[PDB]
Nucleic acid binder design. Structure first.
Ligand SMILES: [Mg+2]
Ligand SMILES: [Mg+2]
Ligand SMILES: [Mg+2]
Ligand SMILES: [Mg+2]
Ligand SMILES: [Mg+2]
Ligand SMILES: [Zn+2]
Ligand SMILES: [Zn+2]
Lengths: 100, 67, 205, 137, 70, 36, 52
RNA sequence: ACGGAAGGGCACCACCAGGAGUGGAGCCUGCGGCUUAAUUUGACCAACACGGGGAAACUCACCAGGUCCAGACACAAUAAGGAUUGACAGAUUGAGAGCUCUUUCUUGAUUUUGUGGGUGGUGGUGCAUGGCCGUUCUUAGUUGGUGGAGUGAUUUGUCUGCUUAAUUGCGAUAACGAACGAGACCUUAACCUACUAAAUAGUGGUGCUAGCAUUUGCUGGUUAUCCACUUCUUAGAGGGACUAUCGGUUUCAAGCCGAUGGAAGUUUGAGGCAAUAACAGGUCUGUGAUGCCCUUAGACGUUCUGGGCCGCACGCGCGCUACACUGACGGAGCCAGCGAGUCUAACCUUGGCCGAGAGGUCUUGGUAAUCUUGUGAAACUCCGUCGUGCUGGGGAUAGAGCAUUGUAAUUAUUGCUCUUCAACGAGGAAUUCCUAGUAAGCGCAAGUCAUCAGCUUGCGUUGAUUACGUCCCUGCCCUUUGUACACACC
């Protein structure tokens, strides 16, 4: 068996939690032991800019936000099954990085 | 101000017009059946409607009110 | 990093969207959807006309794949495009904006084109539409003509939830004209997301 | 056995264990909170309920995250909540109720955390409400 | 545009074998990313080839996508 | 204003890549080839 | 050839907006490298949204 | 629509009660004026630390100068017996510039030259435009269907009154039933001893057990040291507030006012979004968005050198520092939060070393809840020196020297040490912002960044006084009314 850590990162909370639950269920039906999915704090990439494309008007500012939500699940499994777990994660929008 | 708009007052009025042999004058049990007899799309709006329904039921027992 | 990686991916998507908007305008381009898989990058472009995107049995698709490849420095074979027809027909604001732009460029009365677009949008299941034409219709003080049919909301989260808005710059021999199309899809037949309005209260008995 | 206390942003975690009247704030006794004027503000929840009144309990707080006064209030309420929870779990319930009533009759947010949070600042002026000075001519 | 004849023959060789070239709008770039000529030569020699057809140029954020025709 | 005098009908140095067509120009003591 | 390049490795002349090539109003946060106007235009397209 | 008529209503961009102020001083910054080769330009509630405009180069658009075509492509002519290109060395030039000349090589149909025709422009037009944005508007207004009134355009609905933040609702009533806006909605900041899971978070105890005390107690420490858990922290799903209950006030209610409970009872606090529309509001100096005009090889294209944007009898605005003891200075106490940070390479930097300081060197951790960082911030607190003085308050002006960033610090980029210690003794007429974790004081992170804060955007620390109203002023909205306006008072 091989102990690994799968990191899931995306801005779509529903789509990210979908894989964060699919991985857990796919390791439960295979009956592994895992340290439960840890939820690292969401990074708000807030960026403040001036509404006016020029220098006229009331000084009105507007901030955009990009919420990056990250999660990490660490478990152990042999190669044949860990590759299946890393191939089930094809959710559009969520990037998945496996580290041994 | 805490004035209630149309989407609260009219919904509470209809809830009474169709569910009088139903929810009493307690808000806690007034908001519970709102989920099963009404498809409210936000818990805050559900709470507002249930609260106004509770108020209307508490003031209906002391004289019929218009509409 | 990750903060930079996802910002770069967003910029990458924006660049692809603008590239396909400028390239496949005559193909009725509607929207890009990058799917970054470990093996390959499946970029799926959704257009109303997915035969002018194929060309002579895939020539144009191949050359578009090679264009994005040679711009974004990929390894040959690690990326691929996919032309897809939009199940969402003229309910699509960008599609109708491009339709109106092409009608106004090949010659059509502004009011007639706007009414035709609104009629098509409404008869294609849409719950309300609005077309705004701003600029020099005939050389003047540049009034703004509005044509709105049906039901439309403008404020709150619902405008993000179910409203599609697209603007377009039409360039005729007198000035530039802005074409804004706002299509409000019917929340009941949404098939995803909220299925009603926040204030829509329905009771049964 | 483990309670918390917050005033604005400071959080003080109180551990109340079976022991002999050891009241530690950061490893030091309660006599070394050292604003030199709010030492009585940390003495409040002792002299409120009972002078010693406690040879069976030990309170150990750890506070971080705010400013000097915020931490002082955070510990002064964390230790009171720890005492209340200890009486709730182990000692006695009428005793807990009487001591909570004695706390509330002097309540300085000893039991309930202050709800006031910093208002977000809006552009066009320093602060949440104050605006930049405006000139007409 | 005054370019070594040879320096244009490689441009056509690459452009014909591949069929696509994406030239960053940099008139001072010492060397093109894909062709061993400067991007100034690539862009302007090709621009000259776009005035006879068989090349369509799109800009798409200052990168000069070129596609051939039949 | 390159005049480029007509140069009507008409040795060798280092940098051996020169293909023996780099005949030197003789003003005086000019030991640098036509290229450099 | 040897006069057509003053060095531009730093300063406002070193970087331009990746969209419009303007040297002013540039946003270099998170590696955007987009002018403050072009970013307002293509903000939803990148993933930056307005919530508060 | 407007009015220089009237009546209601709302509003700390109005006031009343106050706080902090500004206006008075010095300095920073922007605007004007003046000057200048240039001191680029837009903008005059809704311009003036605004153009994210903190400009050494660039940016740059201005000035003094200097190169190149990056003039597609026809088409002719030049040209396969050579159209054109580049050139070392000297004059020339700031320039190691083949720009041009003294000189003769070099390359070879790619271009000179016409000739049309392109192309670029931070050139003009924001009164030709698009898009965006500002203002009206931190305002509540706008509109169908059926019915009623009118020949009709149209009108009622959309209102006397009350209530609300609100055309919010009650209520009245030829209206009824509704739609957009408001609200709902979304984000965030509050709580939740409840669910889920966490050597990328923490807490309990076991061995590793250095200190003190010595009947085992306190604090200490063990980043591969064990077990248990999620009170602290994180974030998914949910819960919770709906003004709950109880009184009083309502005319009939919407509501309002108190008390209790509650984490939260002022739309729960704050924002995002925000209807019909109107402005000749700003932006052609963001756009490879753009009509038209101008220019286009002695260029208004582009590039390089240098300067200017900062220039100083003077007026104005946003601000920073002060006028001191509720203080200054010196030691000590050592308490946040929002954030950012380099793999094609130079970012945040821990630690050791050198130095009085800025800073320099060797490494280390970090592509990040891991490391910077527990951002050991400041105001603040304690103990001392000062003794009310143009003083030890105040740090303007200038000199000398030392480093950093930068190809390049002169018109001092900035930092550092020493030295002079200017006005300023609380600021006239006027005038801005503000009702609770708010004003104010205080600093920090990010943006602009190779370097540079007195700027902005957010964040957190300490935390008042007064008020819980009004139309006295101002501004706006609605209604009534006048019109010979309708291109609508330009
Ligand atoms: Mg709203
Ligand atoms: Mg120019
Ligand atoms: Mg009417
Ligand atoms: Mg200036
Ligand atoms: Mg600024
Ligand atoms: Zn040679
Ligand atoms: Zn830009």
């Amino acid at each position: 068996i091989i102990k690994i850590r799968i990191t899931l990162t995306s801005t779509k909370v529903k789509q990210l939690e979908n894989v964060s639950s699919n991985i857990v269920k796919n390791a439960e039906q295979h009956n592994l032991v895992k340290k439960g999915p840890v939820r690292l704090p969401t990074k708000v990439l807030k960026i403040s800019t001036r509404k006016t494309p020029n220098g006229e008007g009331s000084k009105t500012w507007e901030t955009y936000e990009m919420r990056i939500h990250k999660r990490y699940i660490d478990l152990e499994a042999p190669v044949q099954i860990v590759k299946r777990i890393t191939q089930i994660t094809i959710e559009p929008g969520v990037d998945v990085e496996v580290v041994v | 101000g805490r004035v209630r708009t149309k989407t609260v007052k009219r919904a509470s009025k209809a809830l009474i017009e169709r569910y009088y042999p139903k929810l009493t004058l307690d808000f806690q049990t007034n908001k519970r059946l709102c989920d099963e007899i009404a498809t409210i799309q936000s818990k805050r709006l559900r709470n507002k409607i249930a609260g106004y329904t509770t108020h209307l039921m508490k003031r209906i027992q002391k004289g019929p009110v218009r509409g | 990093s990750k903060k930079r990686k996802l910002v770069a991916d967003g910029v990458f998507y924006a660049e692809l969207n603008e590239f396909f908007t400028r390239e496949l305008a005559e193909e009725g381009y509607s929207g890009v959807e990058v799917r970054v898989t470990p093996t390959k990058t499946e970029v799926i472009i959704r257009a109303t006309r997915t035969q002018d995107v194929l060309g002579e049995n895939g020539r144009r698709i191949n050359e578009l794949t090679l264009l994005v490849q040679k711009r974004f420095k990929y390894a040959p074979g690690t990326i691929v495009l996919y032309a897809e027809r939009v199940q969402d027909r003229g309910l699509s604001a960008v599609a109708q904006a491009e339709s109106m732009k092409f009608k106004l460029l090949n010659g059509l009365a502004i009011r007639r084109a706007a009414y035709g677009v609104v009629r098509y949008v409404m008869e294609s299941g849409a719950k309300g539409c609005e077309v705004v034409v701003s600029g020099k219709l005939r050389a003047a003080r540049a009034k703004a003509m509005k044509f709105a049919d049906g039901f439309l909301i403008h404020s709150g989260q619902p405008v993000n939830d179910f409203i599609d808005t697209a603007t377009r710059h039409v360039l005729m021999r007198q000035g530039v004209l802005g074409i804004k199309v706002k299509i409000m899809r019917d929340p009941a037949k949404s098939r995803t997301g909220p299925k009603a309005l926040p204030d829509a209260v329905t009771i049964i008995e | 056995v483990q309670t918390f206390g917050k005033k604005k942003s400071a959080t003080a975690v109180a551990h109340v264990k079976a022991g002999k009247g050891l009241i530690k704030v950061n490893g030091s006794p309660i006599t070394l909170v050292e604003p030199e004027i709010l030492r009585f503000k940390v003495y409040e929840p002792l002299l409120l309920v009972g002078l010693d009144k406690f040879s069976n309990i030990d309170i150990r707080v750890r506070v971080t995250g705010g400013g000097h006064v915020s931490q002082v209030y955070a510990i002064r309420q964390a230790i009171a909540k720890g005492l209340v929870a200890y009486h709730q779990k182990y000692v006695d319930e009428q005793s807990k109720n009487e001591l909570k009533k004695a706390f509330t009759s002097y309540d300085r947010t000893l039991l309930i955390a202050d709800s006031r949070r910093p208002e977000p600042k809006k552009f066009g002026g320093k602060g949440a409400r104050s605006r930049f000075q405006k000139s007409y001519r | 545009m005054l370019m070594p004849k040879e320096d244009r023959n490689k441009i056509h060789q690459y452009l014909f074998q591949e069929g696509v070239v994406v030239a960053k709008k940099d008139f001072n770039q010492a060397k093109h990313e894909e062709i061993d000529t400067k991007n100034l030569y690539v862009i302007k020699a090709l621009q000259s080839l776009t005035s006879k057809g068989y090349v369509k140029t799109q800009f798409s954020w200052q990168y000069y996508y070129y596609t051939l025709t039949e | 204003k390159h005049k480029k005098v007509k140069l009507a009908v008409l040795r060798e140095c280092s940098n051996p890549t020169c293909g023996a067509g780099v005949f030197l120009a003789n003003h005086k003591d000019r030991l640098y080839c036509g290229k450099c | 050839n040897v006069w057509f390049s003053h060095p531009r490795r730093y300063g406002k002349g070193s970087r331009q907006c990746r969209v419009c090539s303007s040297h002013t109003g540039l946003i270099r946060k998170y590696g955007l490298n987009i002018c403050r106007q072009c970013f307002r235009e293509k903000a939803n397209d990148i993933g930056f949204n307005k919530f508060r």
